[PDB]
Symmetry: C3
Subunit: 303 residues, 3 copies
């Protein structure tokens, strides 16, 4: 891998670039360092990644880029807490992040409820996220695609549970309950990473941290990536108006003037608390929280 990449890829605020045919190679490098070169047979791994790529749709935000972006943050976190996680947790978490928003259409779980989409019926809650996980299992079941074929039956099942759990946590609606719980448990000292239940919740926050990691990049990246996600939200807002429903101001394109305020409110109520709590639990994740604040100050500089 090129010289500037090797150096900067260890940084939290890294951007993966505009060259799509490098991302597969970038991801493999992250796996070969955090996990190891023995972890996965390489032939099977590329085959897997190509298929995951194939099943990300060409939407503005929730796309193959995001997937690899989200995965890299998880790599940074893994590299700065190398002593904390097992072989199977490092294997399963990078993979989870890559598959975490598979076959996403660019519509929230809200919109899939009110459209009466077949997926809403099949999955009552966390619609897209269970889909994302089902897609993941489908891709694993293709021939030459079981990247976990070295594993024993016992180990295979645990890593699927990690991945299953992790992906679900990316449902932003479950983050709030999960953080408030971790906040309590840190302050009272009851939080303990040898307790599998506690361990799950931290990983959950880790996944939320990564899912939002566009707010921990440099300002030019954070501001341009904002255009992508509004492209999706305004589209979903247009489809709400088609249903006759009034969409919330976050998705109404006729309220671009209220964007600065919304970003302000979103950092205060969600982004900052996320990285605040994450830093407490994993001190080496400070840069995410710092970079987050820098972008919060820039949203103020607008208004």
């Amino acid at each position: 891998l090129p010289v500037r990449l090797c150096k900067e890829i260890e940084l939290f605020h890294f951007d993966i670039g505009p060259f799509e045919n490098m991302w597969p190679g970038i991801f493999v490098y992250m796996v070969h360092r955090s996990c190891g070169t023995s972890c996965f047979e390489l032939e099977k791994l590329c085959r897997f990644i190509m298929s995951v790529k194939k099943n990300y749709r060409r939407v503005p935000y929730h796309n193959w880029k995001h997937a690899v972006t989200v995965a890299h943050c998880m790599y940074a976190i893994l590299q700065n807490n190398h002593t904390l996680f097992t072989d199977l947790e490092r294997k399963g978490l990078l993979i989870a992040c890559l598959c975490h928003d598979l076959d996403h259409r660019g519509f929230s779980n809200s919109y899939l409820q009110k459209f009466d989409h077949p997926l809403a019926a099949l999955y009552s809650t966390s619609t897209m996220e269970q889909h994302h996980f089902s897609q993941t299992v489908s891709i694993l079941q293709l021939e030459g695609h079981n990247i976990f074929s070295t594993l024993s039956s016992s180990e295979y099942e645990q890593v699927l549970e990690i991945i299953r759990k992790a992906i679900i946590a990316t449902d932003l609606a479950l983050y709030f309950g999960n953080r408030k719980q971790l906040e309590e448990m840190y302050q009272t000292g009851s939080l303990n990473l040898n307790n599998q239940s506690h361990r799950d919740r931290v990983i959950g926050l880790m996944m939320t941290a990564c899912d939002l990691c566009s707010v921990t990049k440099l300002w030019p990246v954070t501001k341009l990536t904002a255009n992508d996600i509004y492209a999706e939200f305004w589209a979903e807002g247009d489809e709400m108006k088609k249903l006759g429903i009034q969409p919330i101001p976050m998705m109404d394109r006729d309220k671009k003037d209220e964007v600065p305020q919304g970003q302000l409110g979103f950092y205060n109520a969600v982004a900052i608390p996320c990285y605040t709590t994450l830093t407490q639990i994993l001190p080496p994740t400070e840069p995410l929280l710092k970079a987050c604040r820098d972008n919060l100050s820039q949203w103020e500089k607008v208004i």
Copy 2:
């Protein structure tokens, strides 16, 4: 098919949604109700639809969405006049609507004349529309694609004539002559649906009604769909300027300020008269005309 769809799909102002991989299933449902489950062998029908889909290009307006939209209106009209049409007319009209603007490039017959396109030479008048029909026959001749293989030789030929005739009527230039003729014939009581010549002209107006049915949707749908068609017209206007020709204000992107007036003039001169005459001939088609007027009032509310 999902609960909200079953209910609302019987409504004229229905929108088919942003999910492409439902449209095939929606269309089949419309066929299985208006026509019947025996009408078409299902294996052959999907194969047919997939190929029709494949031959719609990715243009802003005249696309796979429009095709299915236009087809649904025809279904609503069929369902509210179930007693008027034969087996072969219901078979052939939904199919015609789906294929009616096949392989459309997003350029009018006007622009294909002045570019000296090979299609202009091959079809002097109604260039795109004969193309649309030729495309349709090509798709029917593929193996496993003759959805009319149950039919006798006699019946097959008639349904092709229905489809041939119907598609041609979508040429907006032929609508004016066809309406004025139907207006006369209704008022003087000479109009008679047992006269095959009269029958053809009504179907013609039905196809024009469906081709324009974006003006009979709810206001948010009608207004956003407007953006799509101007995307095409302004592109064609750009290609005129490339030829050195001055394009008409409908296609000049430098005259966005004249859009409200143009829509006003278009409803008065074309859209309203179309649905006015259609209501007289088929009373159950009132909702289209009402919805049309509601959108006319909204264009006034602008200026």
Copy 3:
């Protein structure tokens, strides 16, 4: 080929139209006139073109359209100086123009340097242009794709050198040195087209003339094509800001107000001198220089 095309395709300011599936046929016509019908076996030639088409990416400016546009200018120049070039130079120059910006991503050699892209390492200078040529050889080596299989070993090698040389000259950074040299040599009468070294440099200027030939079209074409290239530059400018680097005002989308001035400065410093020197050396290329000036006056009419 259609009547209006036959006529206008001999004109310098010709536009190739918005119909992609004609461009292959247009290009073959240009080859069959300037070069001849014996030059290339037709089966192999289409196969070649389809593959070249396949390897142009869907970027705003540097795309399959540009390639065919650039190639046509070269055809006009060839047709108005028919007595000056050999069989192998006519074969090789149209082909070179079609392949000249193969697999272009829409990023300059500047951006590929600062991203530390693998191509920057492989080709120190003229990064994209050597790539373009390598792509060309790759496409020639496919089975049924050696359009130069009639040629003797001797002739094949020379035409590859013509193509190699020509493509490299499209690197705008090498144009300045090449023009200043030709300017001197014309005025002092030392310039001589029987001297292979001099011959190369003229061809170089010819390729630069063609690469920029969007400035020698009619004004509506020149002005709209401008939107395409800024789409690319502003994207590259966005990727610079992502790297933390400040991009030059040509690529900063926040400076759209400085576009008129930039186009002004670009015509004076590059475009006009190019066609000025080209006219001196090949008098029949006057129309390019005239059309160029007309577009320079229109940029003044803005400010």
